Structure formats: structure tokens, C-alpha cells
Design a protein around this ligand. Structure first.
Ligand SMILES: COc1ccc(S(=O)(=O)N(Cc2cccnc2)[C@@H](C(=O)NO)C(C)C)cc1
Ligand SMILES: [Ca+2]
Ligand SMILES: [Ca+2]
Ligand SMILES: [Ca+2]
Ligand SMILES: [Zn+2]
Ligand SMILES: [Zn+2]
Ligand SMILES: [Zn+2]
Length: 158
């Protein structure tokens, strides 16, 4: 449905996974937002005071919405499309083991996908798109938005 009317957008990390150290969580999330700001007029800013447009939450099982997480494996993450309140928020399953690299579920890659939803994208049919609804680890230096991702997001934020 609706897209952000404004081009200045805040995010707050509600809480931290104990799987990675704090600085690595910040880094992953920052880099994930950068991916999208790189191809749009959107500007993202992290806050810890006031109210963020996008709340980033790590939680297991039932966590206050109607989409409970399911333990280790399966559902990794979900996010809500643009809007007030819960709109834009991105939730990560704490029962996953979040990693800077290949040996669990990579936070950066998962967050790029989740944030795509937070900005209003649905799933892609293109297996090389970040919005493809299958997790597959890629070298975070071999990482790139596909043409379908870029086309998609630019159709929303021209
Ligand atoms: C690359 O980033 C990813 C983030 C999340 C997932 S996810 O497996 O958790 N996933 C898609 C899915 C996969 C398999 C079977 N049913 C649903 C959720 C999803 O698409 N959330 O955004 C779905 C259950 C809502 C996969 C990849
Ligand atoms: Ca929100
Ligand atoms: Ca899970
Ligand atoms: Ca965990
Ligand atoms: Zn719902
Ligand atoms: Zn949730
Ligand atoms: Zn998804």
C-alpha cells in the first residue's frame, strides 16, 4: 500500500541480540539502510531519543504482534510496510543465531530484505533479488541489489 511521504526517516534499535557484540549490530543495520539510500532520495538516521519511524526489535516467540516467531530456523524476520505506529517496524527472531558472517543467519542480508518491506516493497520472483523470499548467504562484498530491487524501490520513491 502506502509509501513514506517524507524523505527523512528515523530508526531506533529497541534492543540488542546477545549473539553479536553491540557495534556489529549497529554496523549491520547501518549498512543495510545505506543499501537503500544509495539508490533512492531517502535519508536514514538512527535515534535513541524520541520516536523512530522504524523500530528494530529482536524477540523470540510471541512478541506483541499477531505473528509469533517459531523457534530456531523457519521464520527469520518480518517487517511492516510504511505507516504510523507499528508501520515500518522490523522484527528479528532471537531464536536465530545472528552473525556478521556465514556461520548462522547473517544479520545484514536479512535486514536488507526486512527494510525493503519497511519501505513498501513486496516479495520478488527474481532469485537474485534481495526481496526474494528465500535466505541464501552471499559474501557481503559480493552483495548487490538486483535490477528488480532497484526498479522496485525507485518506482516507489522517484
Ligand atoms: C533475505 O531475508 C529474508 C528474511 C526473512 C526470510 S523468512 O524465511 O523469514 N520469510 C519468507 C519465507 C521463507 C520460506 C517459507 N515461508 C516464508 C519471511 C519474510 O519474507 N519476511 O520478510 C516470511 C515468513 C514473512 C527469508 C529471507
Ligand atoms: Ca513504525
Ligand atoms: Ca525462527
Ligand atoms: Ca539468538
Ligand atoms: Zn498482522
Ligand atoms: Zn513481529
Ligand atoms: Zn520478506
Amino acid at each position: 500500500g502506502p509509501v513514506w511521504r517524507k524523505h527523512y526517516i528515523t530508526y531506533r534499535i529497541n534492543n540488542y541480540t546477545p549473539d553479536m557484540n553491540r557495534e556489529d549490530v549497529d554496523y549491520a543495520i547501518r549498512k543495510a539502510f545505506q543499501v537503500w539510500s544509495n539508490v533512492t532520495p531517502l535519508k536514514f538516521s538512527k535515534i535513541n531519543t524520541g520516536m523512530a519511524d522504524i523500530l528494530v526489535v529482536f524477540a523470540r516467540g510471541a512478541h506483541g504482534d499477531f505473528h509469533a516467531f517459531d523457534g530456531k530456523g523457519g521464520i527469520l524476520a518480518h517487517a511492516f510496510g510504511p505507516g504510523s505506529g507499528i508501520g515500518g517496524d522490523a522484527h528479528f527472531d532471537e531464536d536465530e543465531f545472528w552473525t556478521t558472517h556465514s556461520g548462522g543467519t547473517n544479520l545484514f542480508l536479512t535486514a536488507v530484505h526486512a527494510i525493503g518491506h519497511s519501505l513498501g516493497l513486496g516479495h520478488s520472483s527474481d532469485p537474485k533479488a534481495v526481496m526474494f523470499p528465500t535466505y541464501k548467504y552471499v559474501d557481503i562484498n559480493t552483495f548487490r541489489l538486483s535490477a528488480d530491487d532497484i526498479r522496485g524501490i525507485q518506482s516507489l520513491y522517484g
